[PDB]
Design a protein around this motif. Structure first.
Motif, PDB file in Angstrom:
ATOM      1  N   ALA A 287       0.825  -1.177  -0.108  1.00  0.00           N
ATOM      2  CA  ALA A 287      -0.161  -0.149   0.015  1.00  0.00           C
ATOM      3  C   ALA A 287       0.742   1.333   0.083  1.00  0.00           C
ATOM      4  O   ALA A 287       0.444   2.329  -0.638  1.00  0.00           O
ATOM      5  CB  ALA A 287      -1.032  -0.026   1.138  1.00  0.00           C
ATOM      6  N   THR A 288       1.911   1.480   0.785  1.00  0.00           N
ATOM      7  CA  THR A 288       2.812   2.715   0.780  1.00  0.00           C
ATOM      8  C   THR A 288       4.095   2.502  -0.124  1.00  0.00           C
ATOM      9  O   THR A 288       5.092   3.388   0.010  1.00  0.00           O
ATOM     10  CB  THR A 288       3.168   2.831   2.323  1.00  0.00           C
ATOM     11  N   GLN A 289       4.216   1.456  -0.703  1.00  0.00           N
ATOM     12  CA  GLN A 289       5.333   1.280  -1.786  1.00  0.00           C
ATOM     13  C   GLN A 289       4.970   2.097  -2.791  1.00  0.00           C
ATOM     14  O   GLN A 289       3.935   2.344  -3.046  1.00  0.00           O
ATOM     15  CB  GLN A 289       5.569  -0.227  -2.210  1.00  0.00           C
ATOM     16  N   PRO A 290       6.003   2.450  -3.777  1.00  0.00           N
ATOM     17  CA  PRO A 290       5.792   3.039  -5.038  1.00  0.00           C
ATOM     18  C   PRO A 290       4.658   2.629  -5.866  1.00  0.00           C
ATOM     19  O   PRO A 290       4.601   1.334  -6.076  1.00  0.00           O
ATOM     20  CB  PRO A 290       7.145   3.192  -5.658  1.00  0.00           C
ATOM     21  N   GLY A 291       3.745   3.225  -6.272  1.00  0.00           N
ATOM     22  CA  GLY A 291       2.345   2.783  -6.905  1.00  0.00           C
ATOM     23  C   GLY A 291       1.351   2.376  -6.188  1.00  0.00           C
ATOM     24  O   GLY A 291       0.303   2.179  -6.617  1.00  0.00           O
ATOM     25  N   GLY A 292       1.827   1.831  -4.809  1.00  0.00           N
ATOM     26  CA  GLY A 292       0.518   1.617  -3.844  1.00  0.00           C
ATOM     27  C   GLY A 292      -0.376   2.765  -3.581  1.00  0.00           C
ATOM     28  O   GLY A 292       0.077   3.885  -3.861  1.00  0.00           O
ATOM     29  N   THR A 293      -1.868   2.271  -3.406  1.00  0.00           N
ATOM     30  CA  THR A 293      -2.585   3.483  -3.263  1.00  0.00           C
ATOM     31  C   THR A 293      -2.547   4.499  -2.013  1.00  0.00           C
ATOM     32  O   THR A 293      -3.337   5.467  -2.099  1.00  0.00           O
ATOM     33  CB  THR A 293      -4.389   2.746  -3.295  1.00  0.00           C
ATOM     34  N   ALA A 294      -1.746   4.015  -1.190  1.00  0.00           N
ATOM     35  CA  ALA A 294      -1.448   4.783   0.108  1.00  0.00           C
ATOM     36  C   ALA A 294       0.081   5.387   0.001  1.00  0.00           C
ATOM     37  O   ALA A 294       0.431   5.512   1.155  1.00  0.00           O
ATOM     38  CB  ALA A 294      -1.696   4.139   1.445  1.00  0.00           C
ATOM     39  N   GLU A 295       0.721   5.457  -1.063  1.00  0.00           N
ATOM     40  CA  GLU A 295       1.915   6.043  -0.981  1.00  0.00           C
ATOM     41  C   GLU A 295       2.095   7.307  -0.683  1.00  0.00           C
ATOM     42  O   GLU A 295       1.302   8.405  -1.015  1.00  0.00           O
ATOM     43  CB  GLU A 295       2.435   5.795  -2.484  1.00  0.00           C
ATOM     44  N   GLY A 296       3.121   7.693   0.295  1.00  0.00           N
ATOM     45  CA  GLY A 296       3.137   9.085   0.848  1.00  0.00           C
ATOM     46  C   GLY A 296       2.421   9.469   1.922  1.00  0.00           C
ATOM     47  O   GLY A 296       2.447   9.537   3.006  1.00  0.00           O
ATOM     48  N   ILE A 297       0.960   9.545   1.419  1.00  0.00           N
ATOM     49  CA  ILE A 297      -0.370   9.769   2.334  1.00  0.00           C
ATOM     50  C   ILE A 297      -0.689   8.931   3.702  1.00  0.00           C
ATOM     51  O   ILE A 297      -0.989   9.345   4.687  1.00  0.00           O
ATOM     52  CB  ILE A 297      -1.467  10.149   1.663  1.00  0.00           C
ATOM     53  N   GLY A 298      -0.151   7.679   3.407  1.00  0.00           N
ATOM     54  CA  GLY A 298      -0.441   6.696   4.377  1.00  0.00           C
ATOM     55  C   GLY A 298       0.679   6.219   5.387  1.00  0.00           C
ATOM     56  O   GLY A 298       0.723   5.506   6.075  1.00  0.00           O
ATOM     57  N   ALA A 299       2.086   6.756   4.737  1.00  0.00           N
ATOM     58  CA  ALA A 299       3.228   6.458   5.386  1.00  0.00           C
ATOM     59  C   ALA A 299       3.327   7.060   6.992  1.00  0.00           C
ATOM     60  O   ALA A 299       2.974   8.164   7.151  1.00  0.00           O
ATOM     61  CB  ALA A 299       4.504   7.073   4.785  1.00  0.00           C
ATOM     62  N   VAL A 300       3.872   6.338   7.762  1.00  0.00           N
ATOM     63  CA  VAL A 300       4.138   6.629   9.336  1.00  0.00           C
ATOM     64  C   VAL A 300       5.677   6.578   9.520  1.00  0.00           C
ATOM     65  O   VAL A 300       6.210   5.376   9.469  1.00  0.00           O
ATOM     66  CB  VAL A 300       3.439   5.654  10.316  1.00  0.00           C
ATOM     67  N   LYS A 301       6.374   7.598   9.566  1.00  0.00           N
ATOM     68  CA  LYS A 301       7.884   7.826   9.577  1.00  0.00           C
ATOM     69  C   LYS A 301       8.263   6.759  10.507  1.00  0.00           C
ATOM     70  O   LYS A 301       8.226   6.886  11.564  1.00  0.00           O
ATOM     71  CB  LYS A 301       8.181   9.111  10.078  1.00  0.00           C
ATOM     72  N   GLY A 302       9.341   5.788   9.875  1.00  0.00           N
ATOM     73  CA  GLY A 302       9.887   5.046  10.804  1.00  0.00           C
ATOM     74  C   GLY A 302       9.087   3.707  11.068  1.00  0.00           C
ATOM     75  O   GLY A 302       9.940   2.940  11.734  1.00  0.00           O
ATOM     76  N   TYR A 303       8.078   3.499  10.704  1.00  0.00           N
ATOM     77  CA  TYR A 303       7.341   2.139  10.914  1.00  0.00           C
ATOM     78  C   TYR A 303       6.821   1.754   9.633  1.00  0.00           C
ATOM     79  O   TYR A 303       6.115   2.387   8.775  1.00  0.00           O
ATOM     80  CB  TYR A 303       6.203   2.396  11.853  1.00  0.00           C
ATOM     81  N   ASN A 304       6.891   0.399   9.506  1.00  0.00           N
ATOM     82  CA  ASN A 304       6.157  -0.374   8.426  1.00  0.00           C
ATOM     83  C   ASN A 304       4.720  -0.453   8.617  1.00  0.00           C
ATOM     84  O   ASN A 304       4.342  -1.074   9.601  1.00  0.00           O
ATOM     85  CB  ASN A 304       6.854  -1.813   8.418  1.00  0.00           C
ATOM     86  N   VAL A 305       4.094   0.015   7.246  1.00  0.00           N
ATOM     87  CA  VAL A 305       2.526   0.202   7.557  1.00  0.00           C
ATOM     88  C   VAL A 305       2.073  -0.895   6.443  1.00  0.00           C
ATOM     89  O   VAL A 305       2.327  -1.258   5.164  1.00  0.00           O
ATOM     90  CB  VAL A 305       2.247   1.780   7.068  1.00  0.00           C
TER      91      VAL A 305
END
Length: 330
Positions: free
Chosen positions: A230-248
């Motif tokens: 989801a937060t990998q490049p191309g995932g639907t939550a890329e950037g906007i769903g990232a929690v700095k320092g933690y795997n989401v």
């Protein structure tokens, strides 16, 4: 001393973020539920109203997780199984399925299909399993039943008998349409993947309901791996769903809902996540509801998750992730 499970600080973060989000986006209401993985304990439930347990809505593509889990549990697909994705796909039963946005046709793995949330890919995953089997998984994940939370006015939601599904329902129920869910059901459902395939009924009172095996431990782990797309490049939550320092691990959704007008004028933007993805400590479900407009899971609801998760990781003293975010080939 205090017999409620609610963490007061987390609850303020939740309510603050959610109110800001509802306003920022011009919605009418929102809801959020945070569950402690493994105990069913509610760390936050906003708003300070039943709403989280009584308001029902079509959740959209967060429901793709039930479809995915069914096909994997039934050993019909693996995360690296390939299907063709395209702007539209005409199905055996005559239904034309469309992706949210047109794009170049290509072959992609199940993992990538879910990360991109491609409908055309998802319907093919869902067709590998019968409707009665999927329906059974939906029930096992807790849809169409009260969670049993000791709060007043809980709604069961709407899960129509599969015998009632026509050609369109056959497919829409694979991506969270043609069903209605509460926010508490969404959180309970996503927690399964961080709990080795076990559903744990939610609790707001600590004390001073039986859990159940929904999918195998293996299915749970692979879905948890898949959700990290989801937060990998191309995932639907890329950037906007990232929690700095933690795997989401996350899933986004948006679905048209029925307005008071009687027509499909409203949208619910949903987000269900598990963090840290390598060893989840909390399960979060967020919905924002808009009356005459569209909200997206990623842009409306993900920031609410991010605020809550950033505080929760501090409050619970969880160190930043030391392993990479999981990636399957796409």
């Amino acid at each position: 001393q205090d017999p409620l499970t609610i963490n007061a600080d987390l609850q303020r973060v939740a309510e603050e973020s959610l109110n800001a989000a509802v306003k920022r986006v011009g919605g009418v209401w929102g809801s959020a539920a945070v569950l402690e993985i493994g105990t069913g304990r509610l760390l936050a439930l906003a708003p300070g109203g039943t709403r989280s347990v009584s308001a029902i809505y079509e959740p959209g593509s967060v429901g793709k997780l039930v479809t995915l889990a069914a096909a994997i549990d039934q050993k019909k697909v693996t995360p690296t199984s390939t299907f063709t994705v395209s702007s539209t796909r005409d199905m055996p039963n005559g239904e034309r399925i469309s992706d949210d946005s047109p794009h170049e046709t290509q072959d992609m793995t199940v993992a990538g299909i879910i990360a991109h949330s491609y409908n055309t890919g998802t319907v093919q995953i869902g067709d590998t399993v019968s409707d009665s089997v999927r329906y059974e998984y939906m029930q096992k994940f807790g849809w169409g039943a009260k969670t049993g939370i000791t709060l007043p006015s809980e709604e069961s939601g709407i899960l129509r008998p599969h015998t009632e599904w026509g050609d369109r329902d056959h497919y829409t129920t694979m991506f969270g349409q043609g069903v209605a869910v509460t926010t508490i059901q969404l959180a309970q459902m996503v927690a399964v993947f961080g709990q080795k395939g076990v559903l744990i009924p939610p609790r707001i009172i600590d004390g001073y309901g039986e859990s159940r095996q929904v999918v195998s431990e293996d299915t749970a782990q692979t879905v948890l791996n898949i959700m990290q797309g989801a937060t990998q490049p191309g995932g639907t939550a890329e950037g906007i769903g990232a929690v700095k320092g933690y795997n989401v691990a996350a899933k986004t959704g948006t679905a048209e809902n029925v307005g008071s007008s009687g027509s499909l004028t409203d949208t619910a933007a949903t987000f269900t996540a598990l963090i840290p993805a390598e060893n989840p400590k909390i399960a979060v479900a967020v919905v924002i509801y808009k009356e005459n407009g569209t909200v997206y899971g990623s842009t409306a609801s993900a920031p609410v998750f991010v605020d809550i998760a950033q505080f929760a990781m501090r409050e619970m003293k969880i160190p930043p992730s030391t392993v990479p975010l999981y990636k399957y080939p796409w």
